[PDB]
Design a protein around this motif. Structure first.
Motif, PDB file in Angstrom:
ATOM      1  N   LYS A  25       0.826  -1.200   0.000  1.00  0.00           N
ATOM      2  CA  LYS A  25       0.000   0.000   0.000  1.00  0.00           C
ATOM      3  C   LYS A  25       0.865   1.257   0.000  1.00  0.00           C
ATOM      4  N   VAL A  26       0.634   2.129  -0.977  1.00  0.00           N
ATOM      5  CA  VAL A  26       1.391   3.370  -1.088  1.00  0.00           C
ATOM      6  C   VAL A  26       1.150   4.270   0.119  1.00  0.00           C
ATOM      7  N   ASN A  27       2.134   5.108   0.431  1.00  0.00           N
ATOM      8  CA  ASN A  27       2.030   6.022   1.562  1.00  0.00           C
ATOM      9  C   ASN A  27       1.606   5.278   2.825  1.00  0.00           C
ATOM     10  N   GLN A  28       2.094   4.050   2.973  1.00  0.00           N
ATOM     11  CA  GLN A  28       1.765   3.233   4.136  1.00  0.00           C
ATOM     12  C   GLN A  28       2.975   2.426   4.592  1.00  0.00           C
ATOM     13  N   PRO A  29       3.125   2.281   5.918  1.00  0.00           N
ATOM     14  CA  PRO A  29       4.237   1.533   6.511  1.00  0.00           C
ATOM     15  C   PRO A  29       4.125   0.033   6.262  1.00  0.00           C
ATOM     16  N   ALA A  30       5.202  -0.561   5.760  1.00  0.00           N
ATOM     17  CA  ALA A  30       5.225  -1.991   5.478  1.00  0.00           C
ATOM     18  C   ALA A  30       6.529  -2.623   5.953  1.00  0.00           C
ATOM     19  N   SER A  31       6.419  -3.565   6.886  1.00  0.00           N
ATOM     20  CA  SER A  31       7.590  -4.244   7.428  1.00  0.00           C
ATOM     21  C   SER A  31       7.488  -5.752   7.219  1.00  0.00           C
ATOM     22  N   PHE A  32       8.634  -6.426   7.249  1.00  0.00           N
ATOM     23  CA  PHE A  32       8.675  -7.871   7.062  1.00  0.00           C
ATOM     24  C   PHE A  32       9.686  -8.513   8.008  1.00  0.00           C
ATOM     25  N   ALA A  33       9.582  -9.827   8.172  1.00  0.00           N
ATOM     26  CA  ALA A  33      10.487 -10.561   9.047  1.00  0.00           C
ATOM     27  C   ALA A  33      11.478 -11.394   8.240  1.00  0.00           C
ATOM     28  N   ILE A  34      12.600 -11.737   8.862  1.00  0.00           N
ATOM     29  CA  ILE A  34      13.627 -12.532   8.200  1.00  0.00           C
ATOM     30  C   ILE A  34      14.032 -13.728   9.054  1.00  0.00           C
ATOM     31  N   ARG A  35      13.679 -14.924   8.594  1.00  0.00           N
ATOM     32  CA  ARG A  35      14.006 -16.147   9.316  1.00  0.00           C
ATOM     33  C   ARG A  35      15.494 -16.464   9.201  1.00  0.00           C
ATOM     34  N   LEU A  36      16.085 -16.916  10.303  1.00  0.00           N
ATOM     35  CA  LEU A  36      17.504 -17.255  10.327  1.00  0.00           C
ATOM     36  C   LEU A  36      17.705 -18.727  10.669  1.00  0.00           C
ATOM     37  N   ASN A  37      18.326 -19.463   9.752  1.00  0.00           N
ATOM     38  CA  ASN A  37      18.583 -20.884   9.958  1.00  0.00           C
ATOM     39  C   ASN A  37      19.880 -21.097  10.730  1.00  0.00           C
ATOM     40  N   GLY A  38      20.271 -20.091  11.508  1.00  0.00           N
ATOM     41  CA  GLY A  38      21.491 -20.188  12.289  1.00  0.00           C
ATOM     42  C   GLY A  38      22.640 -19.421  11.664  1.00  0.00           C
ATOM     43  N   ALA A  39      22.314 -18.361  10.932  1.00  0.00           N
ATOM     44  CA  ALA A  39      23.328 -17.542  10.280  1.00  0.00           C
ATOM     45  C   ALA A  39      23.591 -16.264  11.069  1.00  0.00           C
ATOM     46  N   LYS A  40      24.826 -16.106  11.535  1.00  0.00           N
ATOM     47  CA  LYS A  40      25.209 -14.927  12.304  1.00  0.00           C
ATOM     48  C   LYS A  40      26.149 -14.035  11.501  1.00  0.00           C
ATOM     49  N   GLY A  41      26.332 -12.804  11.967  1.00  0.00           N
ATOM     50  CA  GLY A  41      27.207 -11.873  11.280  1.00  0.00           C
ATOM     51  C   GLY A  41      26.639 -10.468  11.234  1.00  0.00           C
ATOM     52  N   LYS A  42      26.219 -10.040  10.048  1.00  0.00           N
ATOM     53  CA  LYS A  42      25.652  -8.709   9.871  1.00  0.00           C
ATOM     54  C   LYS A  42      24.418  -8.757   8.975  1.00  0.00           C
ATOM     55  N   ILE A  43      23.462  -7.875   9.245  1.00  0.00           N
ATOM     56  CA  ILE A  43      22.234  -7.817   8.462  1.00  0.00           C
ATOM     57  C   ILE A  43      22.070  -6.453   7.799  1.00  0.00           C
ATOM     58  N   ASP A  44      21.786  -6.462   6.502  1.00  0.00           N
ATOM     59  CA  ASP A  44      21.601  -5.226   5.750  1.00  0.00           C
ATOM     60  C   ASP A  44      20.299  -5.263   4.956  1.00  0.00           C
ATOM     61  N   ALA A  45      19.497  -4.212   5.095  1.00  0.00           N
ATOM     62  CA  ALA A  45      18.225  -4.124   4.390  1.00  0.00           C
ATOM     63  C   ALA A  45      17.957  -2.700   3.916  1.00  0.00           C
ATOM     64  N   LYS A  46      18.032  -2.493   2.606  1.00  0.00           N
ATOM     65  CA  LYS A  46      17.797  -1.177   2.024  1.00  0.00           C
ATOM     66  C   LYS A  46      16.788  -1.259   0.882  1.00  0.00           C
ATOM     67  N   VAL A  47      16.098  -0.151   0.628  1.00  0.00           N
ATOM     68  CA  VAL A  47      15.105  -0.097  -0.438  1.00  0.00           C
ATOM     69  C   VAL A  47      15.635   0.670  -1.644  1.00  0.00           C
ATOM     70  N   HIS A  48      15.539   0.054  -2.818  1.00  0.00           N
ATOM     71  CA  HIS A  48      16.008   0.680  -4.050  1.00  0.00           C
ATOM     72  C   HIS A  48      14.844   1.280  -4.832  1.00  0.00           C
ATOM     73  N   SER A  49      15.143   2.283  -5.652  1.00  0.00           N
ATOM     74  CA  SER A  49      14.120   2.946  -6.453  1.00  0.00           C
ATOM     75  C   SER A  49      14.633   3.231  -7.861  1.00  0.00           C
ATOM     76  N   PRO A  50      13.720   3.181  -8.844  1.00  0.00           N
ATOM     77  CA  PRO A  50      14.055   3.431 -10.249  1.00  0.00           C
ATOM     78  C   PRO A  50      14.402   4.893 -10.510  1.00  0.00           C
ATOM     79  N   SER A  51      14.203   5.733  -9.500  1.00  0.00           N
ATOM     80  CA  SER A  51      14.492   7.157  -9.623  1.00  0.00           C
ATOM     81  C   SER A  51      15.977   7.432  -9.404  1.00  0.00           C
TER      82      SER A  51
END
Length: 106
Positions: A25-51
């Motif tokens: 939904k545009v102009n609306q907050p949207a979050s998601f979860a990320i399951r981990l099968n036992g992977a440690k280290g660092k997590i990165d999540a960024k949103v890309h745009s065609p602009s």
């Protein structure tokens, strides 16, 4: 050495959950979860745009096996999610999500 600098990483060992692709939904907050099968280290999540802009999504650690990532899906077409783990794009990445839904509110 033995305890320190590590070679390969566990990025492919990650599964996405509660991820909207055809129900955003545009102009609306949207979050998601990320399951981990036992992977440690660092997590990165960024949103890309065609602009040509790169925004940063809010990443909070709630569980040692689960994480939350909120982001505002605002584009003029299709969005492209970019997930990085220890310097490597997880499986099925980047991810595609078509904003919009079949219906009329009003």
């Amino acid at each position: 050495g033995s305890s320190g600098s590590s070679g390969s990483d566990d990025a492919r060992r990650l599964t996405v959950m509660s991820l909207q692709e055809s129900g955003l939904k545009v102009n609306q907050p949207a979050s998601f979860a990320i399951r981990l099968n036992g992977a440690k280290g660092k997590i990165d999540a960024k949103v890309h745009s065609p602009s040509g802009a790169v925004e940063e999504c809010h990443v909070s650690e709630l569980e040692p096996d689960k994480y939350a990532v909120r982001f505002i899906p605002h584009e003029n077409g299709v969005h492209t999610i970019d997930v990085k783990f220890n310097g490597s794009h997880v499986v099925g990445s980047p991810f595609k999500v078509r904003v919009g839904e079949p219906g009329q509110a009003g």
